[PDB]
Amino acid sequence: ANSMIRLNVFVRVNETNREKAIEAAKELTACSLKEEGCIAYDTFESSTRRDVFMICETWQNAEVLAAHEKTAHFAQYVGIIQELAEMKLEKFEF
Amino acid sequence: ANSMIRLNVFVRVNETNREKAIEAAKELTACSLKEEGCIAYDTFESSTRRDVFMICETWQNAEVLAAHEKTAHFAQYVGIIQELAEMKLEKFEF
């Protein structure tokens, strides 16, 4: 505080669900980028492991991140990804 | 210290150079993973921006990272990526 926050969210997904999970992350990416406190947000697929992708995020501070996590689009798309795949969130401060 | 270190290395690359830069990162990924203090290392392509990819790394500590940066494979492949593309390294401690 009032430091920026970097999230690295690693997602493991099978071949049946791979495209659907990535699309849901892509949809969540477009939604989150409209949030004022969202500094950066993108979905990245592993170039070496078909079953791995990640979400990289930068949040202005802890409070805009907390607000993000209370949004409808967050609940909707994270719910979807969690149903399709396994997620591990890692958080770091600048 | 003696904390783990997370690197997020963002790479911007044009269409002519895109595949070559990713392959060089992939080659560097295989090399770095053989290093004992390398906890994790992978190349990820943006699902939304063709010209963006990233390297995500986890290092056991500051000293194994310093040693990594003195290796021949580091100089070779980073040199290659730098010639093909623009790199921005961000470092965080666990």
Residue A79 in contact with residue B69, Cβ under 8 Å? no
Angle at A90 between CA B54 and CA A81, to 5 degrees: 80
Separation between Cα atoms, residue A6 and residue A56, nearest integer Å: 7
Distance in Å, alpha carbon of B91 to nearest chain A alpha carbon: 9
Going by C-alpha positions, the residue among A19, A42, A21, A9 that lies closest to residue A85 is: A21
List all residues 6 or more positions away from B40 whose beta carbon is below 8 Å from its beta carbon.
B56, B57, B58
In chain B, residues with a C-beta closer than 8 Å to the C-beta of A45 are 44-45, 47
Residue ranges of domains in chain A: 1-94
Residue A53 in contact with residue A22, Cβ under 8 Å? yes
Separation between Cα atoms, residue A63 and residue B4, nearest integer Å: 26
Residue B12's DSSP bridge partners are B52, B86
Quickly tell me which residue has 């993000």 as its tokens: A68
Tell me which of 3.40.50.300, 3.30.70.100, 3.30.565.10, 1.20.1090.10 is the CATH number of domain B1-94: 3.30.70.100
Q: Per the omega criterion (within 30 degrees of 0), is the bond before B8 cis?
A: no
Separation between Cα atoms, residue B42 and residue A25, nearest integer Å: 19
Q: Could you report how far apart the first and last alpha carbons of chain A are, in Å?
A: 9
Helix (H) or strand (E) holding A11: strand A5-12
Which parts of A1-94 fold into alpha helices (H)?
18-32, 62-68, 72-84
Pick the residue from chain A with its C-alpha nearest to B94: A92
- DSSP 3-state assignment of A31? helix
List all residues 6 or more positions away from A52 whose beta carbon is below 8 Å from its beta carbon.
A10, A11, A12, A13, A45, A46, B42
Going by C-alpha positions, the residue among B18, B91, B4, B81 that lies closest to residue B52 is: B18
List all residues 6 or more positions away from A88 whose beta carbon is below 8 Å from its beta carbon.
A9, A10, A11
Q: A43 and B45: CB-CB below 8 Å?
A: no
In chain A, residues with a C-beta closer than 8 Å to the C-beta of B6 are 8, 90, 92
Mutate to test the interface with A, among B44, B51, B91 (most CBs of A within 10 A): B44
Distance in Å, alpha carbon of B6 to nearest chain A alpha carbon: 9
Separation between Cα atoms, residue A13 and residue B12, nearest integer Å: 26
DSSP H helix total and E strand total for chain B: 3, 4
Determine how many CB atoms are found less than 10 A away from the CB of residue B66. 11
Q: A43 and B48: CB-CB below 8 Å?
A: yes
Residue A55 in contact with residue A25, Cβ under 8 Å? yes
Going by C-alpha positions, the residue among B7, B24, B9 that lies closest to residue B86 is: B9
Residue B77 in contact with residue B29, Cβ under 8 Å? no
